Amino acid sequence: DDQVKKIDKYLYAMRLSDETLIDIMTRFRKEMKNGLSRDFNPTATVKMLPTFVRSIPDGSEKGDFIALDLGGSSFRILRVQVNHEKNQNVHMESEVYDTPENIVHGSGSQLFDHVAECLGDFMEKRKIKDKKLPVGFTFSFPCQQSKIDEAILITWTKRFKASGVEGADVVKLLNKAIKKRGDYDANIVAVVNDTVGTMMTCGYDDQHCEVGLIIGTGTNACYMEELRHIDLVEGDEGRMCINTEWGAFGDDGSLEDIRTEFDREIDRGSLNPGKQLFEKMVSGMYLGELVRLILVKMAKEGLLFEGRITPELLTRGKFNTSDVSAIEKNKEGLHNAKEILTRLGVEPSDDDCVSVQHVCTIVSFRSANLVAATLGAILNRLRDNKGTPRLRTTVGVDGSLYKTHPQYSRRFHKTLRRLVPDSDVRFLLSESGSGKGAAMVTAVAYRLAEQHRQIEETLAHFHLTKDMLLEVKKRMRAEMELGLRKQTHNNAVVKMLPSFVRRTPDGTENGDFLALDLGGTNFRVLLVKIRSGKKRTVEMHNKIYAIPIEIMQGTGEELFDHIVSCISDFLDYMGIKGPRMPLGFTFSFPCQQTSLDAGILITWTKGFKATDCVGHDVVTLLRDAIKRREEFDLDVVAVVNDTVGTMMTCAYEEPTCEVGLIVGTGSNACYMEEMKNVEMVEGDQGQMCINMEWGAFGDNGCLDDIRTHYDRLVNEYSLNAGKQRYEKMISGMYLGEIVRNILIDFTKKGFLFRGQISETLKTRGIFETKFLSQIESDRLALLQVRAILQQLGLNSTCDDSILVKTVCGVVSRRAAQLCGAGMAAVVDKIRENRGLDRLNVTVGVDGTLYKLHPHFSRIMHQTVKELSPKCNVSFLLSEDGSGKGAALITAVGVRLRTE
Amino acid sequence: TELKDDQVKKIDKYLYAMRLSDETLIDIMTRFRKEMKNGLSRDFNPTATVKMLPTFVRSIPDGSEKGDFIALDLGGSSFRILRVQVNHEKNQNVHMESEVYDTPENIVHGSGSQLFDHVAECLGDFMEKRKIKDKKLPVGFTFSFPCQQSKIDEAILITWTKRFKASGVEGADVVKLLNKAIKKRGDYDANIVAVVNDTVGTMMTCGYDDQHCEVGLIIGTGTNACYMEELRHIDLVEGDEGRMCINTEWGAFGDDGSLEDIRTEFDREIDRGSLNPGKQLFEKMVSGMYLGELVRLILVKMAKEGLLFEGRITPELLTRGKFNTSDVSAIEKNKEGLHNAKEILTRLGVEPSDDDCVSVQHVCTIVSFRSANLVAATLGAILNRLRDNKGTPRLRTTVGVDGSLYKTHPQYSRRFHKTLRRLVPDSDVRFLLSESGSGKGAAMVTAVAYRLAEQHRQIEETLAHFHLTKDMLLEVKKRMRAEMELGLRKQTHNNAVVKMLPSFVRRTPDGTENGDFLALDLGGTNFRVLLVKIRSGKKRTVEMHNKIYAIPIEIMQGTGEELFDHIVSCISDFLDYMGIKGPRMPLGFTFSFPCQQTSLDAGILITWTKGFKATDCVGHDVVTLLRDAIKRREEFDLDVVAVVNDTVGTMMTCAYEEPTCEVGLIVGTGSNACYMEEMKNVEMVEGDQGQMCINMEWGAFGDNGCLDDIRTHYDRLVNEYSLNAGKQRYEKMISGMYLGEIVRNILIDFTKKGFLFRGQISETLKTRGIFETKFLSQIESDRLALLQVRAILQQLGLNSTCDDSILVKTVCGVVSRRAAQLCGAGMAAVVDKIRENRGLDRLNVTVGVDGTLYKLHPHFSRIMHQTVKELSPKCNVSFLLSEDGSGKGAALITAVGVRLRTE
Ligand SMILES: Nc1ncnc2c1ncn2[C@@H]1O[C@H](COP(=O)(O)OP(=O)(O)NP(=O)(O)O)[C@@H](O)[C@H]1O
Ligand SMILES: Nc1ncnc2c1ncn2[C@@H]1O[C@H](COP(=O)(O)OP(=O)(O)NP(=O)(O)O)[C@@H](O)[C@H]1O
Numbered sequence A: 001d002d003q004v005k006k007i008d009k010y011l012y013a014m015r016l017s018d019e020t021l022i023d024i025m026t027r028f029r030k031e032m033k034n035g036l037s038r039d040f041n042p043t044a045t046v047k048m049l050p051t052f053v054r055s056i057p058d059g060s061e062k063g064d065f066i067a068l069d070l071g072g073s074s075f076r077i078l079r080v081q082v083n084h085e086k087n088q089n090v091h092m093e094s095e096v097y098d099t100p101e102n103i104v105h106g107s108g109s110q111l112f113d114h115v116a117e118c119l120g121d122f123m124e125k126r127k128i129k130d131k132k133l134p135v136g137f138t139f140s141f142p143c144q145q146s147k148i149d150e151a152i153l154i155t156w157t158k159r160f161k162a163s164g165v166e167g168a169d170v171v172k173l174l175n176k177a178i179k180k181r182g183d184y185d186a187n188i189v190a191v192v193n194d195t196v197g198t199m200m201t202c203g204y205d206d207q208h209c210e211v212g213l214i215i216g217t218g219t220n221a222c223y224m225e226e227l228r229h230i231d232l233v234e235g236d237e238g239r240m241c242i243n244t245e246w247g248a249f250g251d252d253g254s255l256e257d258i259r260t261e262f263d264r265e266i267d268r269g270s271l272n273p274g275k276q277l278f279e280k281m282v283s284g285m286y287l288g289e290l291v292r293l294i295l296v297k298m299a300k301e302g303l304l305f306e307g308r309i310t311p312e313l314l315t316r317g318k319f320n321t322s323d324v325s326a327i328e329k330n331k332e333g334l335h336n337a338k339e340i341l342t343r344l345g346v347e348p349s350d351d352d353c354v355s356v357q358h359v360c361t362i363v364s365f366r367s368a369n370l371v372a373a374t375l376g377a378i379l380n381r382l383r384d385n386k387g388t389p390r391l392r393t394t395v396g397v398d399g400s401l402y403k404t405h406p407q408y409s410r411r412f413h414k415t416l417r418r419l420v421p422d423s424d425v426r427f428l429l430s431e432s433g434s435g436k437g438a439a440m441v442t443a444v445a446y447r448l449a450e451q452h453r454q455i456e457e458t459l460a461h462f463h464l465t466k467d468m469l470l471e472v473k474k475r476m477r478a479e480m481e482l483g484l485r486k487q488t489h490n491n492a493v494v495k496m497l498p499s500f501v502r503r504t505p506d507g508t509e510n511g512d513f514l515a516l517d518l519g520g521t522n523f524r525v526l527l528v529k530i531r532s533g534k535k536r537t538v539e540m541h542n543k544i545y546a547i548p549i550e551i552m553q554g555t556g557e558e559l560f561d562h563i564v565s566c567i568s569d570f571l572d573y574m575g576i577k578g579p580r581m582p583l584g585f586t587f588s589f590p591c592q593q594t595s596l597d598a599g600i601l602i603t604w605t606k607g608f609k610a611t612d613c614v615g616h617d618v619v620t621l622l623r624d625a626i627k628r629r630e631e632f633d634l635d636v637v638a639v640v641n642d643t644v645g646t647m648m649t650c651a652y653e654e655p656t657c658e659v660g661l662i663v664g665t666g667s668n669a670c671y672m673e674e675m676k677n678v679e680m681v682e683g684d685q686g687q688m689c690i691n692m693e694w695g696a697f698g699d700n701g702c703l704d705d706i707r708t709h710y711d712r713l714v715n716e717y718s719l720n721a722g723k724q725r726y727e728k729m730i731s732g733m734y735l736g737e738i739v740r741n742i743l744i745d746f747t748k749k750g751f752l753f754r755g756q757i758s759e760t761l762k763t764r765g766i767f768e769t770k771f772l773s774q775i776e777s778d779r780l781a782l783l784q785v786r787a788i789l790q791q792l793g794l795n796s797t798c799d800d801s802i803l804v805k806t807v808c809g810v811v812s813r814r815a816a817q818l819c820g821a822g823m824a825a826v827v828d829k830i831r832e833n834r835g836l837d838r839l840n841v842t843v844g845v846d847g848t849l850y851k852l853h854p855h856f857s858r859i860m861h862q863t864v865k866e867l868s869p870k871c872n873v874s875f876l877l878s879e880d881g882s883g884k885g886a887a888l889i890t891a892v893g894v895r896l897r898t899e
Numbered sequence B: 001t002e003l004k005d006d007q008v009k010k011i012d013k014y015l016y017a018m019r020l021s022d023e024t025l026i027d028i029m030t031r032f033r034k035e036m037k038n039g040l041s042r043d044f045n046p047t048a049t050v051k052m053l054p055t056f057v058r059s060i061p062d063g064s065e066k067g068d069f070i071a072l073d074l075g076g077s078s079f080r081i082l083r084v085q086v087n088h089e090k091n092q093n094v095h096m097e098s099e100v101y102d103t104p105e106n107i108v109h110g111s112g113s114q115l116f117d118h119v120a121e122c123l124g125d126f127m128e129k130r131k132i133k134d135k136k137l138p139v140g141f142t143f144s145f146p147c148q149q150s151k152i153d154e155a156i157l158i159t160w161t162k163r164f165k166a167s168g169v170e171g172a173d174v175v176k177l178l179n180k181a182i183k184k185r186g187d188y189d190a191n192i193v194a195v196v197n198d199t200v201g202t203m204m205t206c207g208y209d210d211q212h213c214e215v216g217l218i219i220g221t222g223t224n225a226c227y228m229e230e231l232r233h234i235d236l237v238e239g240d241e242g243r244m245c246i247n248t249e250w251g252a253f254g255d256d257g258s259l260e261d262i263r264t265e266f267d268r269e270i271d272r273g274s275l276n277p278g279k280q281l282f283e284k285m286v287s288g289m290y291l292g293e294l295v296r297l298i299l300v301k302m303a304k305e306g307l308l309f310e311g312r313i314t315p316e317l318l319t320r321g322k323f324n325t326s327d328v329s330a331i332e333k334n335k336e337g338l339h340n341a342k343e344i345l346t347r348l349g350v351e352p353s354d355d356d357c358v359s360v361q362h363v364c365t366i367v368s369f370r371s372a373n374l375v376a377a378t379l380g381a382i383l384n385r386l387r388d389n390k391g392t393p394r395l396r397t398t399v400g401v402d403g404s405l406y407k408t409h410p411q412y413s414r415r416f417h418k419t420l421r422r423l424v425p426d427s428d429v430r431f432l433l434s435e436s437g438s439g440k441g442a443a444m445v446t447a448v449a450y451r452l453a454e455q456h457r458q459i460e461e462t463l464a465h466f467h468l469t470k471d472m473l474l475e476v477k478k479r480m481r482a483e484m485e486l487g488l489r490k491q492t493h494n495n496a497v498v499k500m501l502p503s504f505v506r507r508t509p510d511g512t513e514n515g516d517f518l519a520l521d522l523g524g525t526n527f528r529v530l531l532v533k534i535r536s537g538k539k540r541t542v543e544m545h546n547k548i549y550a551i552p553i554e555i556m557q558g559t560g561e562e563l564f565d566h567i568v569s570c571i572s573d574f575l576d577y578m579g580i581k582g583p584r585m586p587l588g589f590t591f592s593f594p595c596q597q598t599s600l601d602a603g604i605l606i607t608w609t610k611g612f613k614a615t616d617c618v619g620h621d622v623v624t625l626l627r628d629a630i631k632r633r634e635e636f637d638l639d640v641v642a643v644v645n646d647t648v649g650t651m652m653t654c655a656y657e658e659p660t661c662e663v664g665l666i667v668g669t670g671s672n673a674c675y676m677e678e679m680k681n682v683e684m685v686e687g688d689q690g691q692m693c694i695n696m697e698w699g700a701f702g703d704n705g706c707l708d709d710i711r712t713h714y715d716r717l718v719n720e721y722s723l724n725a726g727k728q729r730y731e732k733m734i735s736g737m738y739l740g741e742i743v744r745n746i747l748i749d750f751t752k753k754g755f756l757f758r759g760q761i762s763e764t765l766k767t768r769g770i771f772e773t774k775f776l777s778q779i780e781s782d783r784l785a786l787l788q789v790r791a792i793l794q795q796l797g798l799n800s801t802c803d804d805s806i807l808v809k810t811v812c813g814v815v816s817r818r819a820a821q822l823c824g825a826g827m828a829a830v831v832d833k834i835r836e837n838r839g840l841d842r843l844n845v846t847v848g849v850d851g852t853l854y855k856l857h858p859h860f861s862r863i864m865h866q867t868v869k870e871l872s873p874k875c876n877v878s879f880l881l882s883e884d885g886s887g888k889g890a891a892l893i894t895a896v897g898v899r900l901r902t903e
């Protein structure tokens, strides 16, 4: 007939069995799964939050760190000093600062003003204001972080409820507050939950610590999870700590069969009704009020105090968790119950004291059992990830209920071992709270922010502003004008070369021509059939022929014999071997022409370098190889640059096309100039197409104040050291070499590739256009970026791959902007020479970089639009190669060699 | 003996690298198998050479297809145009009429504009010769090139292959381009409803006859295959039920050098002279456009070495194209082969001897046999995949087949079918030859896509009713604005459905309010009792306490004494709870319903709104029913000072700190607004001095008819079935009690019409309340995978499939979007009126807002704000969320109460 048996029955639904706890554990096991999944997280109640902490301390941290801890029973500020090598050591000093009701419940401003004022005082009294120490912030609330130094508040919990904070990044709110008080500056470099710092504190001393557990004012746990299971973070290597935020378990109604009427009543008086329901059955802030609610009910039904209620009894908060602890002490518990109940006014009896003990017992054991169940789900997940029959792991713990209750921990530990027999757990109690740990994470964040600081300074040398880009355009304009004028031309670096093509296609062109395409990525021999009139037709055919690097860099004479010999192969293939036919020679090197069919090679560019060609007439060299072969005669009527033939191609259909552009292996442009402006050729009537040879802009030092160390290495290790400087910042032959030298540096500083500069990274050309374009594609995910780097031969991690991509982007973006600033100049010079206010002009373009890069063309058109706002430029991609155009121009010789 | 080599043995040695054994083909098959898998996964598709592309064709014809439609066939050897009729449920079987339009080189190679103008021209003529311009026939477009499709009537050209190379088309959607040509012409109208691949058309043509058909196979000018994949394995398509045909684009197998070990010098020289070098490399080893050049290349090199023609080489033998694949066919003929070889070679000028003919036949046989072996290896991979998706030991399947080479070569199909069967011994395959083209099949697709678009068109037509144009929104503001005036005018309180009720709060807070107040919160989601301590010091502070109390609907819609007797047990309980029973205390009553007020501390209930309907309330003073229940209790005592609308309480809360906040907005269970109005304008309150907060009772807008215009079938149904038919009409197109009832009604309809829920209206869909503010908020969130939208709906009890889940989410956004715009028209009026009232040119104002819908909905608050900024462009309105309920605000008003009193 005992009183204890009655209560057991009264509170039957709080006495959880092992079967119910095994059931709780399975559900928690599914919530974790839900929260890690990209599919189910948006609705999961157990947020499974990434912490950006990747391991427990490794003994290599050193420094002097200020650390804040706000969110649990006290607000503290610690100064943690840690040094190794030598002798043994981590020193901490800290201060508790009060935070009243008006602060925790006020505006977010008032709270952070409050925080920055205790920080100021803290450093003030120790005199460390100027010692500029990195700050670590233990803020114990669920925050969404994409990096270690952002903390976006998802939702208040426990006792805090300040306006203006939820949804905001509280490190910017903190900075704002500190900024607001000019007193000092603070480098806030990390935010961490109290579970993670706990784990990090315990992990400094115990290498198998993989869990951090808080059973205090609130409850939570964090654990080391595999990167390849955390869908919301990109990577699959190693592990990252996760903040479960288990307090929220049941917030969608899944524990409704466990929660009692006392739990529903507590929730309604709470400062967050509906939320953190598992936490409300477990943590210190609630248990006292839970028993109080049960005592009022038993009291109202005459089962306690022979039914006497007092106001005190009925008052929220009048029974603490510290009274539930005192009441459960072995020798003194009953003496403590009488004093306290006596203080509440119910004139307690000895039976009432044993009854109030029994109730305290069932509430706190229900708490103990519940966290055994969610903690064991975590251990079953750790053990499953590991692949092992048994699991040995250490859980770092902290919290006031955990520390001060005289039965809890023991009860908790026993249940755990029953629920999870295949796991052996050591509990390590955080004697001095979480500062050591937070400090340890602050040290790693700090070393990383420094490495970020340095990559950004290197990369910012590639950044051009509007104002910068307007100065390049303006220099380009001053340079076209010196190459054009008779007095300045010989010393000019941008030669403004006459091509002798005097108009765009006029619809009369007719005939069957041969063409050559030499100087881009493939050499071709072409046959183009053009028919003017009613039904206008163009019929093309072509054959690719390789040219060994031996030949490209052999003798002029091996080069041209090799050329004619594929011509001869090609005339067989088209069934036209015998007849004498006219040919247009698209040769994409700077040529000084005195007519359409003459072209003296000024200098090689790009990868070509045959001997005895520079200084000669390439039409001559070709005609000596034909005669030399003595197989067929040919009639070479025209030497053409790929820009001009590209413009001619695109203008066959588009009369507004007066500009050509190439961005492929090299970069260059042509455009229609007025003859009055071409002082180097006699005559003022009409126009002429000018082959700018814009690659050579900067060859007199005029872009030096924008060229980088890496641009100087690529130029100095080139086949034409000192020349085609602009092209060298823009085209497909050189961008990858820029990117490769940047990566070489970064590797030597340890930022990439584990600091190991390999044989792959030392090989020239590893980053060709095709790979540069893919790596940067919005079509690819980091995963596929990494796989590209690996097939190139690089030992690249996910972090490495994120940085290679950023690099590629910086260099490719700068190339499109530099290319846009020069095109800007050209269109402005045409518009404004014509007296026009608004020019619409079409540019015909070709080249593999331009065709294959996913960003270049968009950024370039944007640049042209921003710097030359009175020109409306259209870019028309030529899909057929340069041949049609050389063919159209070739028809113009013929006619003129035919007079 | 010791056998000595003859021509034939020597040529097998010369061309060893083309003679591929069962071991090498099993290696290729397995490579192809990994490339398909590679193509279907999201982790490797972006760099895959086998694109494994989605076609939107979910199955082979089932025989319900009926109707009449055109069908364009572009990209094989002939540009054809068909007419296809079927409708068996009534008599007449499929019947096919076609033409064939000569398309010249200069077109296949000119601009895309020339190309599509020519196709447009041909369609026109073909429509006149038949006299059908005027019928409105659905059009199908078999376009045999790799294309990215996000739906059946889009086809973005990835790349040209085979013979075509028209500029300005790649990257562009050939449907756009065709329409654009058609448009420019004028002759007729074309409804193009679908683009398929000649593989998919083949599979469907053959499936129409054999329901076992799962593969479409093309070995003609080009080669490709398509097959039915489990939507579970198509990562680039969102969905996991049933199947979808995949068009592999196996021609590009090996682009990336993964076939560089089987490719030879002959295949590397052919690539050098083709229209797309570096592309379609496996196709270049197999298909009709290439087999003839491949033989010619071998013959030139054999002639140069003296193995053929005693070393003679003529200019014909050296010329691209002079030996074609129909030459390879004629030479491989059983009887007449060697004699065909004689003629063909003599026209090449080479004076062929009889040895030379036997040699050439043999090279032709090795080249064409390698091609047949290759397609057997890659089909072998597709068949094994099919067997592994079924989970059987054996597979049974039909392959539908088309292409000139397969049809005309005398030996090919035989050796193909044979090597195939030997490579896949556990499969029982039938090969069905699409005797007459891919048009029957394309027509069957066009027919399923046409029916689907009629549904889509009818869903859009219902939904367009919820779409509000900027001048309609503007007319709604002007309408809101005219009702404001009416409700203020002493003589117009009638068709004054918008009452403009005076709150008797004459100013916002003024740093002097001080004290300990009880407050009550009745009308929203929770009934709460509060303790609010305000101190004015040099330390301005606010301390809040509250407790939620349920109201069991046996009190909600029960009596008034029984409703207030309850409020007052709960007040009694809250004072014990807070430890303050005893002290006579002042109370602020936030009561979220329309009331006529003669002062701060009295208010007669005008009507029940929202969910409340307790009897003996309307026409009574609530502060009087409150006072009675307190006397019935004859326990404690308090001093009721103020009765306040949630609206006025939220504004005041928010203004406790922000002097700009002169407006209050509620969007939760119901919707309402308040603002500070000038007293010269409040005609019903004597005094022309100062200001006054007006509780608009804005939800009643449209109660006289002035929104009838924008109200839909679904809005009238929600209203007719409500506790208060005829009223709070504007509130009924906005708030969270009513939004999901509109959606529910939309879904009921669409389900009767068969567009959704397999057409069954279930007990779940017919339950009021199913679509709560919490699920509408989740359903419409932007971080939602479609798998999750489905899960939720199934959680609710709805048997939703992927596509149902797509239209339920589109229905929710349409409703919730109209709700935020309508709200913003309303707020645009309030803020333009306050500006106007003050003869200002520009107004800066802040609205304090609360409400579960405003808080939880992903888009609502962002669209309302946009709306207000676009319709009152001279006002600059900031909105501040009330994070802790309007109790602070009611308390502040209770502070003024007590002042203005006990003066
Ligand atoms: N699952 C449970 N939930 C609530 N109360 C429980 C539960 N299990 C046991 N109790 C109570 O806990 C007390 C004893 O537990 P405890 O002393 O910690 O265990 P023990 O030392 O292993 N066994 P014991 O000999 O009973 O003391 C008694 O008051 C039991 O009624
Ligand atoms: N794997 C292979 N690759 C290339 N050529 C092959 C291969 N296997 C066999 N051949 C040749 O294929 C020919 C045999 O063709 P096959 O279809 O098996 O019979 P057939 O002689 O053409 N039949 P028939 O019509 O009765 O005369 C011989 O000339 C073989 O040298």
Ligand SMILES: O=P(O)(O)OC[C@H]1O[C@@H](O)[C@H](O)[C@@H](O)[C@@H]1O
Pocket (backbone or CB within 6 Å): A069, A070, A071, A072, A073, A074, A138, A140, A194, A197, A214, A215, A216, A217, A218, A398, A399, A400, A401, A432, A433, A434, A435
């Ligand atoms: O203060 P409690 O809620 O009892 O929790 C105790 C612990 O809580 C954490 O919030 C703090 O990071 C710890 O350093 C503190 O020791």
Ligand SMILES: O=P(O)(O)OC[C@H]1O[C@@H](O)[C@H](O)[C@@H](O)[C@@H]1O
Pocket (backbone or CB within 6 Å): A517, A518, A519, A520, A521, A522, A586, A588, A642, A662, A663, A664, A665, A666, A732, A846, A847, A848, A849, A880, A881, A882, A883
């Ligand atoms: O091949 P790239 O160097 O990228 O340049 C690509 C283009 O190069 C020019 O030099 C050729 O004349 C064009 O016909 C070719 O389309």
Ligand SMILES: O=P(O)(O)OC[C@H]1O[C@@H](O)[C@H](O)[C@@H](O)[C@@H]1O
Pocket (backbone or CB within 6 Å): B073, B075, B076, B077, B078, B142, B144, B198, B201, B218, B219, B220, B221, B222, B288, B402, B403, B404, B405, B436, B437, B438, B439
């Ligand atoms: O025309 P071929 O390339 O030889 O291919 C044969 C088949 O080609 C497809 O592209 C057409 O859509 C079919 O109707 C045709 O019968």
Ligand SMILES: O=P(O)(O)OC[C@H]1O[C@@H](O)[C@H](O)[C@@H](O)[C@@H]1O
Pocket (backbone or CB within 6 Å): B521, B522, B523, B524, B525, B526, B590, B592, B646, B649, B666, B667, B668, B669, B670, B850, B851, B852, B853, B884, B885, B886, B887
């Ligand atoms: O509860 P809802 O109807 O969503 O609107 C929420 C709000 O509405 C009001 O009626 C209450 O006075 C506010 O304190 C509450 O925050």
Ligand SMILES: OC[C@H]1O[C@H](O)[C@H](O)[C@@H](O)[C@@H]1O
Pocket (backbone or CB within 6 Å): A071, A072, A140, A141, A142, A157, A158, A193, A194, A195, A214, A216, A217, A218, A219, A220, A221, A247, A279
């Ligand atoms: O402080 C203990 C726990 O308290 C609450 O659960 C917080 O939401 C959580 O972040 C914290 O770790």
Ligand SMILES: OC[C@H]1O[C@H](O)[C@H](O)[C@@H](O)[C@@H]1O
Pocket (backbone or CB within 6 Å): A519, A520, A588, A589, A590, A605, A606, A641, A642, A643, A662, A664, A665, A666, A667, A668, A669, A693, A695, A727
């Ligand atoms: O091919 C693009 C350009 O490459 C280099 O710039 C050549 O000097 C130039 O003439 C050619 O136009």
Ligand SMILES: OC[C@H]1O[C@H](O)[C@H](O)[C@@H](O)[C@@H]1O
Pocket (backbone or CB within 6 Å): B075, B076, B144, B145, B146, B161, B162, B197, B198, B199, B218, B219, B220, B221, B222, B223, B224, B225, B249, B251, B283
């Ligand atoms: O026409 C047969 C096949 O030819 C080509 O390979 C096309 O790329 C393909 O889409 C078509 O199915």
Ligand SMILES: OC[C@H]1O[C@H](O)[C@H](O)[C@@H](O)[C@@H]1O
Pocket (backbone or CB within 6 Å): B523, B524, B592, B593, B594, B609, B610, B645, B646, B647, B666, B668, B669, B670, B671, B672, B673, B697, B699, B731
């Ligand atoms: O609760 C928001 C609004 O709900 C209904 O519209 C009530 O009639 C109104 O008084 C309240 O302000």
Ligand SMILES: [Mg+2]
Pocket (backbone or CB within 6 Å): A227, A228, A229, A230, A231, A232, A233, A234, A235, A236
């Ligand atoms: Mg991951």
Ligand SMILES: [Mg+2]
Pocket (backbone or CB within 6 Å): none
């Ligand atoms: Mg026990």
Ligand SMILES: [Mg+2]
Pocket (backbone or CB within 6 Å): A675, A676, A677, A678, A679, A680, A681, A682, A683, A684
């Ligand atoms: Mg001149």
Ligand SMILES: [Mg+2]
Pocket (backbone or CB within 6 Å): B231, B232, B233, B234, B235, B236, B237, B238, B239, B240
């Ligand atoms: Mg899928």
Ligand SMILES: [Mg+2]
Pocket (backbone or CB within 6 Å): B679, B680, B681, B682, B683, B684, B685, B686, B687, B688
């Ligand atoms: Mg008045």
